[PDB]
């Protein structure tokens, strides 16, 4: 299955996940610190690694 670009953890549907619009890695929302609500106010998401 898909693995979190941050912690290497497995996708499970009891967790919120978000994808980077630049590098297209998938992440735990918890690892990159984005809640579902926060993500709603975000158009193009840039993951922490991509902000560097």
């Amino acid at each position: 299955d898909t693995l979190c670009g941050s912690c290497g953890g497995n996708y499970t549907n009891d967790e919120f996940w978000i994808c980077c619009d630049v590098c297209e890695r998938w992440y735990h929302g918890k690892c990159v610190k984005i809640t579902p609500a926060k993500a709603e106010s975000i158009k193009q998401y840039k993951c922490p690694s991509c902000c560097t």
Partner: peptide, 7 residues
């Protein structure tokens, strides 16, 4: 953004 929501 692209997301996977909680079931």
């Amino acid at each position: 953004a692209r997301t996977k929501q909680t079931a």
